[PDB]
């Protein structure tokens, strides 16, 4: 299994990025899907999660109501739907399987990043 | 309150108890068929038994037929169980309930521990160990019998941050639990109040943070 | 016996939500089936009976549906009484049984756990005995794991977990993890590690000590 984080790129405060989490390999239906990102010189921070569906999806405090997590089972991928950005969001994005079924945050598999910047 | 139950407590193995359950007048008792629905710690509900309304027919959970009685008396609005051959499994808060009313239940203990008052360790923190602007503190409150016992943080004007943890019964009998609080780490008066009741025991343990 | 299952186990709700917990019989009930709600530390409290007929006094945003082996409770929009242990029960035929519950507790933002180790204290190291305890304080969502680790050693058997209810005004958990050794056992060894792992945590956090140091 590898993933692929794509849908970065640059946009002014209060616009919108669509990013896309796809997985090659083995099927990921089962295993719950979270986003992190990175800032320059700042550590690795939770961001969001899908877990199966009929399982909710959990936010960070700092994305709350601006962005959506949501999956797509037929084409193996997540969705992070980020409306109302802001400069503070600037990271590199990356998504992450939780390896165990029961939620407890055993990511061993993780996607390269994609670059997201806000800004005038 | 229209049913309040009595006659649990302490009791050890192959012991026997007669639980019995008080209807309040207006709770027309006697149109109701009535149980006895126990639940252990940390566990779901499990119906013990049930006495038809005119008391015609009883009905038993299999794991406490020939050991369990349940009967009744009209006249006097009450429900009795007796329970003999008791074994530890039989912990349990113990439920005397019509289908729409429930009682707030009576704790029976099964076990053959002696009450015993609890030890009180401190769980300190370091200058090592507490990094950034939080630190944590605790008791480990250790080998106590039986549930429960209260723990307050500077005799109550500590409250703010505090968890205390629900027991454990070790293999040993005993129960345990920690209490701790996080608090800023450049205030590092902490102590924990351990009350027992059932022993009538009680000890204040001083947290003290050990310096490196 | 009638055996009874509910689902999901858990579920996570906001005040407004509308909720749906089902419970399936082994054998066909067809409408004998009562709900009940239960908040920690009370008697639990009839819903509906009859698995449809909402109990006198119980406000109508409750309503079930369902016959023979498939059941469901609705609530059409959460309020903050709701956050309790619900149970379904079949009334069809003795033993009377009961669904393992369904927890529905408040949702909120993720929140990793701060953790806490402390090493056994002297005076209980006297006694024979060491307790070392591992504090996950304030997470959510309340999935978690704790492994203990002694000179790398994973360890088996030797620890019992306690949790706390969500919190009164965050909404968080709390838990600890204690690991009893002989005294014996406990002075073989350097390292005492307590490894966590958590849905908000990047990687797994490790708080440790070396017995004998400062």
């Known amino acids: 299994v590898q993933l692929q984080e794509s849908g970065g790129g640059l946009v002014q405060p209060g616009g919108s990025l669509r990013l896309s989490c796809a997985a090659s390999g083995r099927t990921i239906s089962s295993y719950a899907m979270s986003w992190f990102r990175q800032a320059p010189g700042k550590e690795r921070e939770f961001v969001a999660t899908a877990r199966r569906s009929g399982d909710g999806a959990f936010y960070a405090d700092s994305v709350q109501g601006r962005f959506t997590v949501s999956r797509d089972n037929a084409k193996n991928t997540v969705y992070l739907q980020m409306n109302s950005l802001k400069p503070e969001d600037t990271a590199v994005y990356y998504c992450?399987?939780?390896?165990?079924?029961?939620?407890?945050?055993?990511?061993?598999?993780w996607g390269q990043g994609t670059q997201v910047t806000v800004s005038s | 309150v229209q049913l309040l139950e009595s006659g649990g407590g302490l009791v050890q193995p192959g012991g026997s108890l007669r639980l019995s359950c008080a209807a309040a007048s207006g709770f027309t008792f006697s149109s109701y068929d009535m149980s006895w629905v126990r639940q252990a710690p940390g566990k779901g509900l499990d119906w013990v038994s049930t006495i038809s309304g005119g008391g015609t027919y009883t009905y038993y959970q299999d794991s406490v037929k020939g050991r369990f009685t349940i009967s009744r008396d009209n006249s006097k609005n009450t429900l009795y169980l007796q329970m003999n051959s008791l074994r530890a499994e039989d912990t349990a808060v113990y439920y005397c309930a019509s289908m729409d009313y429930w009682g707030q239940g009576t704790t029976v203990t099964v076990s053959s521990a002696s009450t015993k008052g609890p030890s009180v360790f401190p769980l300190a923190p370091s200058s090592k160990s507490t990094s950034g602007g939080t630190a944590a503190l605790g008791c480990l409150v250790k080998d106590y019998f039986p549930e429960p016992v209260t723990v307050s943080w500077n005799s109550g004007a500590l409250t703010s941050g505090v968890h205390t943890f629900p027991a454990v019964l070790q293999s040993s009998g005993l129960y345990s639990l920690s209490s701790v609080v996080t608090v800023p780490s450049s205030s590092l008066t902490y102590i924990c109040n351990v009350n027992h009741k059932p022993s009538n025991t009680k000890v204040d343990k001083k947290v003290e943070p050990k310096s490196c | 016996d009638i055996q009874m299952t509910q689902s999901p186990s858990s579920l996570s709700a906001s005040v407004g939500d509308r909720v749906t917990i089902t419970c399936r019989a082994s054998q066909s009930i067809r409408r004998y089936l009562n709900w009940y709600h239960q908040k920690p530390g009370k008697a639990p409290k009839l819903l509906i009976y009859g698995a449809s007929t909402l109990q006198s006094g119980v406000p109508s945003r409750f309503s079930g549906s369902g016959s023979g082996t498939d059941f469901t409770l609705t609530i059409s929009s959460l309020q903050p009484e709701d956050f309790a242990v619900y149970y379904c029960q079949q009334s069809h035929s003795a033993p009377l049984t009961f669904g393992g519950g369904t927890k529905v507790e408040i949702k909120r933002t993720v929140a990793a756990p701060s953790v806490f180790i402390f090493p056994p204290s002297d005076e209980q190291l006297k006694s024979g005995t060491a307790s070392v305890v591992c504090l996950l304080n304030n997470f959510y969502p309340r999935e978690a794991k704790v492994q203990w680790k002694v000179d790398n050693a994973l360890q088996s058997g030797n620890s019992q977990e306690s949790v706390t209810e969500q919190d009164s005004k965050d909404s968080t958990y709390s838990l600890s993890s204690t690991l009893t050794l002989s005294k014996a056992d406990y002075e073989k060894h350097k390292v005492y590690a307590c490894e966590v792992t958590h849905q908000g945590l990047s990687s797994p956090v490790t708080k440790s000590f070396n017995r004998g140091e400062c």
């Open positions: 992450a399987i939780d390896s165990d079924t029961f939620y407890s945050g055993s990511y061993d598999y």
